Scaffold this active site. Structure first.
Site, mmCIF file in Angstrom:
data_model
loop_
_atom_site.group_PDB
_atom_site.id
_atom_site.type_symbol
_atom_site.label_atom_id
_atom_site.label_comp_id
_atom_site.label_asym_id
_atom_site.label_seq_id
_atom_site.Cartn_x
_atom_site.Cartn_y
_atom_site.Cartn_z
ATOM 1 N N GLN A 133 -11.642 13.605 -44.283
ATOM 2 C CA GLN A 133 -10.633 13.726 -44.315
ATOM 3 C C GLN A 133 -9.860 13.632 -43.367
ATOM 4 N N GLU A 187 4.292 -2.430 -14.030
ATOM 5 C CA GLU A 187 5.231 -2.938 -14.033
ATOM 6 C C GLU A 187 6.401 -1.076 -14.324
ATOM 7 N N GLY A 212 -21.649 7.568 -29.885
ATOM 8 C CA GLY A 212 -21.621 7.220 -28.840
ATOM 9 C C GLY A 212 -21.439 5.344 -28.866
ATOM 10 N N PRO A 263 0.574 -1.012 0.225
ATOM 11 C CA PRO A 263 0.068 -0.391 -0.131
ATOM 12 C C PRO A 263 0.918 1.572 -0.438
ATOM 13 N N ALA A 291 4.323 1.244 -0.518
ATOM 14 C CA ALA A 291 5.632 1.500 -1.439
ATOM 15 C C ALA A 291 5.089 0.504 -2.592
ATOM 16 N N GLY A 292 4.971 0.967 -3.552
ATOM 17 C CA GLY A 292 4.748 0.069 -4.867
ATOM 18 C C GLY A 292 6.297 0.758 -6.248
ATOM 19 N N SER A 293 5.946 2.119 -6.340
ATOM 20 C CA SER A 293 7.343 2.501 -6.883
ATOM 21 C C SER A 293 9.154 2.020 -6.710
HETATM 22 C C1 LIG Z 1 -3.805 -4.057 -12.796
HETATM 23 C C2 LIG Z 1 -2.788 -3.897 -11.476
HETATM 24 C C3 LIG Z 1 -2.339 -5.131 -11.134
HETATM 25 C C4 LIG Z 1 -1.377 -4.873 -11.118
HETATM 26 N N1 LIG Z 1 -0.270 -6.143 -10.741
HETATM 27 C C5 LIG Z 1 0.748 -6.164 -9.743
HETATM 28 C C6 LIG Z 1 1.370 -7.423 -9.118
HETATM 29 O O1 LIG Z 1 0.269 -8.498 -9.555
HETATM 30 N N2 LIG Z 1 2.330 -7.691 -8.411
HETATM 31 C C7 LIG Z 1 2.204 -6.747 -8.025
HETATM 32 O O2 LIG Z 1 3.676 -6.824 -6.814
HETATM 33 N N3 LIG Z 1 2.103 -4.948 -7.937
HETATM 34 C C8 LIG Z 1 0.856 -5.162 -9.225
HETATM 35 N N4 LIG Z 1 0.684 -4.654 -9.749
HETATM 36 C C9 LIG Z 1 1.085 -2.646 -8.579
HETATM 37 C C10 LIG Z 1 2.093 -1.773 -8.879
HETATM 38 O O3 LIG Z 1 3.140 -2.370 -10.187
HETATM 39 C C11 LIG Z 1 1.529 -0.471 -8.764
HETATM 40 O O4 LIG Z 1 0.897 -0.141 -8.766
HETATM 41 C C12 LIG Z 1 2.809 0.527 -9.091
HETATM 42 O O5 LIG Z 1 4.249 -0.116 -8.906
HETATM 43 C C13 LIG Z 1 2.767 1.874 -9.010
HETATM 44 O O6 LIG Z 1 3.208 1.981 -7.116
HETATM 45 P P1 LIG Z 1 1.367 2.677 -6.766
HETATM 46 O O7 LIG Z 1 0.272 2.109 -6.974
HETATM 47 O O8 LIG Z 1 2.150 2.740 -5.235
HETATM 48 O O9 LIG Z 1 1.503 4.316 -6.965
HETATM 49 P P2 LIG Z 1 3.318 5.332 -6.521
HETATM 50 O O10 LIG Z 1 4.052 4.764 -6.135
HETATM 51 O O11 LIG Z 1 2.560 6.562 -5.618
HETATM 52 O O12 LIG Z 1 2.981 5.978 -7.978
HETATM 53 C C14 LIG Z 1 2.084 7.289 -8.238
HETATM 54 C C15 LIG Z 1 2.624 7.852 -9.969
HETATM 55 O O13 LIG Z 1 4.248 8.095 -8.748
HETATM 56 C C16 LIG Z 1 5.036 8.509 -10.141
HETATM 57 N N5 LIG Z 1 6.968 8.252 -10.177
HETATM 58 C C17 LIG Z 1 6.826 7.846 -9.902
HETATM 59 N N6 LIG Z 1 7.910 7.333 -9.430
HETATM 60 C C18 LIG Z 1 8.425 8.795 -9.701
HETATM 61 C C19 LIG Z 1 9.496 9.052 -9.860
HETATM 62 N N7 LIG Z 1 10.636 8.883 -9.673
HETATM 63 N N8 LIG Z 1 9.617 10.080 -10.074
HETATM 64 C C20 LIG Z 1 8.297 11.136 -10.698
HETATM 65 N N9 LIG Z 1 7.248 10.517 -10.979
HETATM 66 C C21 LIG Z 1 7.240 8.958 -9.879
HETATM 67 C C22 LIG Z 1 4.032 7.981 -11.447
HETATM 68 O O14 LIG Z 1 3.473 8.401 -12.213
HETATM 69 C C23 LIG Z 1 3.352 6.646 -10.629
HETATM 70 O O15 LIG Z 1 2.123 6.571 -11.345
HETATM 71 C C24 LIG Z 1 -0.666 -3.714 -10.186
HETATM 72 C C25 LIG Z 1 -1.614 -2.955 -10.338
HETATM 73 C C26 LIG Z 1 -2.373 -2.895 -10.936
HETATM 74 C C27 LIG Z 1 -2.849 -1.939 -11.342
HETATM 75 C C1 LIG Z 2 14.133 23.045 -50.503
HETATM 76 C C2 LIG Z 2 13.099 22.923 -51.434
HETATM 77 C C3 LIG Z 2 13.186 21.794 -52.442
HETATM 78 C C4 LIG Z 2 12.595 21.379 -52.946
HETATM 79 N N1 LIG Z 2 12.988 20.310 -54.318
HETATM 80 C C5 LIG Z 2 12.432 20.171 -54.969
HETATM 81 C C6 LIG Z 2 13.264 20.062 -56.593
HETATM 82 O O1 LIG Z 2 13.676 20.121 -56.435
HETATM 83 N N2 LIG Z 2 12.042 19.191 -57.303
HETATM 84 C C7 LIG Z 2 10.491 20.076 -57.321
HETATM 85 O O2 LIG Z 2 9.509 19.230 -57.942
HETATM 86 N N3 LIG Z 2 10.049 19.816 -56.021
HETATM 87 C C8 LIG Z 2 10.950 20.587 -54.851
HETATM 88 N N4 LIG Z 2 10.623 21.419 -53.937
HETATM 89 C C9 LIG Z 2 8.791 21.752 -53.943
HETATM 90 C C10 LIG Z 2 7.749 21.030 -52.955
HETATM 91 O O3 LIG Z 2 8.303 19.584 -53.619
HETATM 92 C C11 LIG Z 2 7.013 21.411 -52.733
HETATM 93 O O4 LIG Z 2 7.347 22.568 -51.766
HETATM 94 C C12 LIG Z 2 5.740 20.019 -52.171
HETATM 95 O O5 LIG Z 2 5.540 19.487 -52.720
HETATM 96 C C13 LIG Z 2 4.199 21.545 -51.971
HETATM 97 O O6 LIG Z 2 3.955 22.643 -52.576
HETATM 98 P P1 LIG Z 2 3.792 23.787 -52.838
HETATM 99 O O7 LIG Z 2 4.314 24.355 -52.582
HETATM 100 O O8 LIG Z 2 2.968 24.101 -54.631
HETATM 101 O O9 LIG Z 2 2.291 24.066 -51.492
HETATM 102 P P2 LIG Z 2 1.050 23.414 -51.875
HETATM 103 O O10 LIG Z 2 0.355 22.118 -52.482
HETATM 104 O O11 LIG Z 2 0.025 24.945 -52.123
HETATM 105 O O12 LIG Z 2 0.732 22.968 -50.784
HETATM 106 C C14 LIG Z 2 0.305 23.337 -49.145
HETATM 107 C C15 LIG Z 2 -0.011 22.171 -48.073
HETATM 108 O O13 LIG Z 2 -1.111 22.405 -48.563
HETATM 109 C C16 LIG Z 2 -1.340 20.763 -47.767
HETATM 110 N N5 LIG Z 2 -1.856 19.664 -48.615
HETATM 111 C C17 LIG Z 2 -1.608 19.270 -49.532
HETATM 112 N N6 LIG Z 2 -2.211 18.964 -50.518
HETATM 113 C C18 LIG Z 2 -3.619 18.828 -49.434
HETATM 114 C C19 LIG Z 2 -4.837 17.411 -49.142
HETATM 115 N N7 LIG Z 2 -4.951 17.100 -50.115
HETATM 116 N N8 LIG Z 2 -5.487 18.169 -48.160
HETATM 117 C C20 LIG Z 2 -4.853 18.858 -47.279
HETATM 118 N N9 LIG Z 2 -4.698 19.316 -47.052
HETATM 119 C C21 LIG Z 2 -2.972 19.423 -47.309
HETATM 120 C C22 LIG Z 2 0.336 20.458 -47.423
HETATM 121 O O14 LIG Z 2 0.082 21.290 -45.485
HETATM 122 C C23 LIG Z 2 1.038 21.372 -47.854
HETATM 123 O O15 LIG Z 2 2.351 21.846 -46.886
HETATM 124 C C24 LIG Z 2 11.269 21.757 -53.299
HETATM 125 C C25 LIG Z 2 10.928 22.527 -52.177
HETATM 126 C C26 LIG Z 2 11.399 23.570 -50.751
HETATM 127 C C27 LIG Z 2 11.523 23.938 -49.723
#
Ligand SMILES: Cc1cc2nc3c(=O)[nH]c(=O)nc-3n(C[C@H](O)[C@H](O)[C@H](O)COP(=O)(O)OP(=O)(O)OC[C@H]3O[C@@H](n4cnc5c(N)ncnc54)[C@H](O)[C@@H]3O)c2cc1C
Ligand SMILES: Cc1cc2nc3c(=O)[nH]c(=O)nc-3n(C[C@H](O)[C@H](O)[C@H](O)COP(=O)(O)OP(=O)(O)OC[C@H]3O[C@@H](n4cnc5c(N)ncnc54)[C@H](O)[C@@H]3O)c2cc1C
Ligand SMILES: Cc1cc2nc3c(=O)[nH]c(=O)nc-3n(C[C@H](O)[C@H](O)[C@H](O)COP(=O)(O)OP(=O)(O)OC[C@H]3O[C@@H](n4cnc5c(N)ncnc54)[C@H](O)[C@@H]3O)c2cc1C
Ligand SMILES: Cc1cc2nc3c(=O)[nH]c(=O)nc-3n(C[C@H](O)[C@H](O)[C@H](O)COP(=O)(O)OP(=O)(O)OC[C@H]3O[C@@H](n4cnc5c(N)ncnc54)[C@H](O)[C@@H]3O)c2cc1C
Ligand SMILES: [Cl-]
Ligand SMILES: [Cl-]
Ligand SMILES: [Cl-]
Ligand SMILES: [Cl-]
Lengths: 388, 387, 388, 388
Positions: free
Chosen positions: B280, B364, B341, B131, B133-135
């Site tokens: 998209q 773990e 949902g 209780p 001591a885990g970590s």
């Molecule tokens: C479903 C389940 C099954 C398990 N099965 C086993 C089993 O079979 N045997 C067994 O021995 N144990 C088992 N455990 C226990 C488990 O190992 C411990 O829950 C775990 O080691 C964390 O210890 P704690 O719950 O006391 O949390 P605490 O030690 O209080 O840690 C709380 C939180 O502190 C953070 N933290 C920890 N150390 C640091 C650090 N140094 N710096 C910053 N943040 C930190 C982490 O986010 C951690 O979750 C199980 C736990 C669960 C939930």
């Molecule tokens: C340093 C450098 C070297 C290059 N070298 C070459 C080269 O040697 N030869 C060459 O032919 N070209 C080269 N390019 C061009 C490069 O391939 C194009 O800039 C790149 O394909 C993006 O085309 P664009 O600039 O016309 O941007 P746009 O086509 O106008 O796109 C703008 C932004 O729209 C977003 N986007 C694109 N398509 C979609 C989509 N379907 N849906 C949603 N978001 C989308 C992306 O975030 C994209 O960056 C180079 C570019 C740079 C900066």
């Protein structure tokens, strides 16, 4: 000996991935106001070191293998991002910018472009987004009109990574075979194409080479089309399915950098007669940073491992990209907070990460796009189970 | 044919785990279609079918293997919980309640108790928390006083699962060799021990057999001690350690049940000229439910895989139990909301889940304790690296 | 002397509200120190005799406190009752909701016949709108009301009906068919003894309250029992719900305040680890967030109530209050359960009961998701009006 | 006429506050359409227009009233922040930087300093934080050693707003009367004091004038001390207690700017055959932005109204500062996301807000400090109730 607590010990990985992780880390330690010149240098250096081969498919074309090793690409972006957003960006775009060629190129197209991508002598780019349509790819309006043996391109692409410095752009344009997503074709467009204009260089909060491209009657030979007319939308989507997991990996790398900064500051910052790390709130915050990193890493490499079994990963890549980018934002934000005033001081690691991470929730598909992909896929799978 | 998009295809699993997962699912479908009486029946049925063998260590004593396959125990609890909280509870307590005997029993003690735990003819229990001591286990006050060839026990344990129906209790008590955590011993206490009183049955929001135990000078033979005097605290902690990831697995199972309910309701509930799933907000909510489930599952089985490689998993198991229990609460809460949902109507699946999940965040090691375990371990590892 | 740090000192309140708050608290301490039906009947009688049911009735001539309903007063009553007893809150709330349609739309005869008995606690009221297939989508209800001479014949079912089985009358909304959807609904006062009105089942919910499914088996209801004109029942239902929307937020707030008191007391008293639970930072931060949520919720509730009492429509403000207070109370209660450890889930402890009691308040009277859409649509509507 | 749905209609406000809100909004529209030079100009312009009088206490010294009108200062910061972080910063520091003089100055000190603060011809600063001690103020180490008719100051202050352009600094230093918080004194230190060096100008993510101050044996006359020796800690805390609610108000203003940008973008951005705002996710996002804004505003002006009754607001100001700053971060982050790639484009409104907000969760007491203040106060109040 393998540290069994390291993520690299996970059975998602093969021994070659552990060796690759060590190799790219060593490259970062030894090799890492002018983002254009920096990007060019990084592409050349990464290329010479062999790291760009992993994002290219086909051994005959300079790739590491005939498939793209997703786990390797992810480890590369993760490690690069952990050290440098610029280096991650450079490697990423050699993958994303050439992926449509790995997936859909002819022999001539693969021969012409992929070896130079793979050795860092051609800078790639992926031109999909438009000023009026980024997420809504299916409604893009850049037009490609057939005129003899060429297509004539008119309109704009924007936010284009490596815009202004790329040697070629994989450009997606409306050819009109059918409405919407069924009317798009893909083209390789060399940067020197007349009528391809760099309309604007774009500045973003974490600077990378970016541009708006204006196509003023730019003529592209029919032989530069990737895949069949009207099949460009699926090619774009399939390319993104590869590299979205790599964006997740980059996010993870940025997060790991923030984690290292945060734990070091917690341990070192003296306050109230002890250290910041002695307080429960700090311990719980560090714990959540680490939890987010491990869940991100597991999602990244689950997706990468799964794609490397030859499976589709539209859902798993979206999940990884979403979680790792949103999570890295939170990790980085927490690291800023641990640093106090220094957390917003310009040029500190965590201040840079706060700027770097924000775009990764937007590019390669915004977070909201990823969420809808996952949600729609859940309902699709349930409907299929009900049917059977 | 293995569905490569299923979690069972992950390389954290071996072929035996895929076969086990199919077997326990089949048992649930055939057998889960008075709480004390139900638990007694479930323990015997699980025992007869072989499923309690996985929580017992030692083939000679009725266990599945000489080590405990924690990936197997996790899959059993995940599957049982997905169908029935009582069935999960029954299997879980046969493990937790006997784990200290598997870890610390003599050959005689293991022979006397473990075969009957494993075949479901003896119901086990684990008596640690108090209780006050885990970590704070170290501050426990249940006393065990040496007297001749017995110890005399006085005080209370509480929240004891299977309290009132167990055949024996593993009891931790203060023998006093040293202060705090260094003064505790462990005992196997038969339910028929004079002075062992079932003082109150405890009702919790999701009803399980639970009791407060009162020890009224209960005499426990010295030969019923588990391990050496004063070594009981470590035995309690190591016993809890065995099954920690399996609590995470049960949480995950409850979440998967809620997910299935939510997706089905989204697809079937007609409203506003369409279905609930066409909106998209619904699609994004379902996606977050799925993300939470996959991250929880990866954390659970990363930790279980790692322990099964012979490694300590203090950080990884704490992460799994924290994430899966907190995440299942969120998933279940969202499924209640999707049902409207009906989501709060007594006895519906989601209303039962809303009650069932809440305790798993508390025992773990409460969520807050898990956070501190992980945070302290991060700082410990950083100190070691910078040394 | 008025404690200026108490919420009752806020200028949202008038002196009469401070006097009322003390009065209802005194009543709770004197009267709220199993068989839910009998308990609700007793509570209605006791609240009625003490004068507390007058505030939910409109019209001094009909037993109401005033000719308008004092929303701030009703909120303070529900907040205080819920802080002590979910059953007492429910009893007072349903005398309001179940009679509101009569206060709004009754003839002089109908108001005289029913409202004085509601106000003195001798007639138990009920509001019958939801159906098994139509809860959120009220406009698609199918309970039919067919005109037959001097009466309407009702056929169909209502469900989730609070006070179902013990009410003396039900305000029933039924489809009379003047036009499709929301334009074909009429409202009727149906006495409990109406032949053909059947209590089909008593419903058990997680926090037990008297609830029933009603079956109408050709129940003949006199035409003179219709509230308002035929086809105007939908707006009557919505306006009746509008009266009491903020009071659902107030009840949520009262439950949260109970949980807060339990949590702070347990933090202060629970010894552990040589100190108390409250000495730990995590506990202090958790208590602080509980208090912040409560103050935010209380400010939103009484902003909305004050505004309605000025004669203003509060579509956005009441939706915000009900959404925030119900979602926030869930969080506060959940945290208090956690502070209690195992005792937090022990049946019948304060926090265990609150964990059950709060859950339905996020679902009925406009689920959280509906509230979000109401607010979002209103923001866009206001923006469109500003830019027009 | 007064729009009763506007927050300015709340009874927390008096008629003069509604007129002030209109006046400062008109000033913003007329005047806000080198960071050091910009701040100097803004201080002069705000001073000439009369807006700096509200942050100064004492009519005889240039203040608006003999008290500081907290509601007025909050409305000023909220409105300024809604238009310009630079303008908000300029007005804020004339308050915070002079508040210790309003509270603790002699007649001579108030006459010398406050009239020029109030008319914007002297720029004020508040020098409390140190490289090794920001949250842990009681352990500051800047020393003040008495030597004849002066104190000799040695050490560093840092993160000092207006550092390098202020005309004086209110400096808190350890004079040593007793340990910790009982050993600090406050001094007005003119910027031209010999031995005061601007050691470093500090760059932060949203640039504002910031410096590290180095005191190298700076002699400060004893007559420059504010209050009695050893009473400086309480003076610092009481000064922060005035203006913490104004930080909440600034946060709210930034959030309102983000809200306006976000709803406008949702309404205007066409996608998927409709607009961004037609999607449920957008509507719910906007709804949550508005909910956070209203709860923040209610908490801000509850605290300001309460302080303006003459009451201590340690708990209520902490709640407001915590909720409004954390909430504004979320609102701004959502507005960035709605803008897509443009959201991280340099110099867009939402990109600037993403940088501007981050420091407000750190300065005038970090979020975690506010949470502990509230949690400890809950336990203190419970202990006092138990004792009574
Ligand atoms: C479903 C389940 C099954 C398990 N099965 C086993 C089993 O079979 N045997 C067994 O021995 N144990 C088992 N455990 C226990 C488990 O190992 C411990 O829950 C775990 O080691 C964390 O210890 P704690 O719950 O006391 O949390 P605490 O030690 O209080 O840690 C709380 C939180 O502190 C953070 N933290 C920890 N150390 C640091 C650090 N140094 N710096 C910053 N943040 C930190 C982490 O986010 C951690 O979750 C199980 C736990 C669960 C939930
Ligand atoms: C340093 C450098 C070297 C290059 N070298 C070459 C080269 O040697 N030869 C060459 O032919 N070209 C080269 N390019 C061009 C490069 O391939 C194009 O800039 C790149 O394909 C993006 O085309 P664009 O600039 O016309 O941007 P746009 O086509 O106008 O796109 C703008 C932004 O729209 C977003 N986007 C694109 N398509 C979609 C989509 N379907 N849906 C949603 N978001 C989308 C992306 O975030 C994209 O960056 C180079 C570019 C740079 C900066
Ligand atoms: C204890 C209790 C007491 C009640 N008392 C009464 C009473 O006295 N009288 C009475 O008439 N009714 C009463 N109700 C019924 C209540 O009003 C309905 O449960 C509620 O309106 C939801 O309807 P539903 O249950 O049919 O859920 P559904 O209509 O099936 O909705 C399910 C879920 O869908 C989501 N949703 C709804 N609309 C949208 C949307 N447009 N977009 C996205 N998501 C959406 C929400 O999350 C919703 O919870 C009570 C309910 C309970 C639980
Ligand atoms: C733009 C800007 C303007 C500023 N202007 C001024 C100014 O004009 N004058 C001035 O004197 N200072 C000013 N400051 C300094 C500011 O007040 C401090 O940065 C702040 O008090 C935090 O102190 P710190 O940076 O030393 O962080 P630390 O004290 O090292 O705190 C680091 C983090 O620890 C956490 N923390 C703190 N205490 C506890 C605790 N007890 N338990 C748990 N966690 C805790 C918080 O998250 C905090 O952010 C300004 C800062 C900025 C960024
Ligand atoms: Cl290999
Ligand atoms: Cl096997
Ligand atoms: Cl009055
Ligand atoms: Cl006035």
């Amino acid at each position: 000996e393998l540290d069994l607590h390291s993520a690299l010990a996970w059975p998602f990985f093969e021994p070659r991935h552990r060796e690759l992780a060590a190799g790219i880390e060593a490259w970062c330690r030894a090799n890492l106001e002018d983002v254009d010149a920096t990007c060019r240098r990084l592409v050349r250096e990464l290329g010479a070191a062999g790291w760009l081969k992993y994002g290219v498919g086909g051994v005959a074309y300079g790739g590491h293998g005939d498939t793209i090793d997703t786990r390797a690409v992810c480890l590369l972006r993760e490690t690069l991002a952990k050290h440098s957003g610029l280096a991650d960006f450079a490697l990423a775009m050699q993958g994303l910018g050439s992926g449509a060629i790995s997936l859909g190129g002819t022999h001539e197209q693969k021969t012409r472009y992929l070896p130079r991508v793979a050795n860092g002598t051609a800078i790639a780019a992926f031109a999909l987004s438009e000023p009026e349509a980024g997420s809504d790819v299916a409604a893009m309006t850049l037009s490609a009109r057939e005129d003899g043996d060429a297509y004539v391109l008119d309109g704009d692409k924007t936010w284009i990574s490596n815009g202004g410095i790329a040697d070629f752009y994989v450009v997606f344009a409306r050819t009109g075979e059918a409405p919407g997503a069924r009317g798009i074709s893909a083209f390789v467009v060399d940067a020197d194409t007349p009528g391809l204009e760099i309309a604007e260089r774009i500045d973003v909060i974490a600077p990378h080479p970016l541009a708006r491209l204006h196509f003023a009657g730019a003529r592209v030979p029919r032989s530069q089309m990737l895949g069949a007319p009207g099949e460009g939308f699926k090619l774009a989507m399939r390319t993104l399915d590869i590299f979205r997991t790599s964006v997740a990996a980059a996010s993870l790398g940025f997060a790991r950098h923030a984690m290292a900064e945060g734990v070091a500051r917690a341990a070192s910052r003296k306050m109230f007669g002890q250290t910041l790390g002695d307080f429960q709130l700090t311990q719980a915050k560090l714990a959540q940073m680490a939890l987010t990193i491990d869940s991100s890493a597991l999602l990244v490499y689950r997706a990468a491992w799964l794609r490397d079994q030859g499976e589709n990963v539209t859902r798993e890549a979206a999940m990884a990209k979403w979680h790792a980018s949103e999570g890295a934002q939170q990790v980085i934000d927490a690291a800023v907070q641990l640093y106090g005033g220094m957390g917003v001081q310009s040029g500190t690691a965590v201040e840079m990460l706060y700027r770097e991470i924000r775009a990764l929730r937007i590019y390669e598909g915004a977070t909201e796009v990823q969420q809808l992909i996952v949600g729609r896929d859940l309902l699709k799978a349930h409907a299929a189970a009900t049917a059977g």
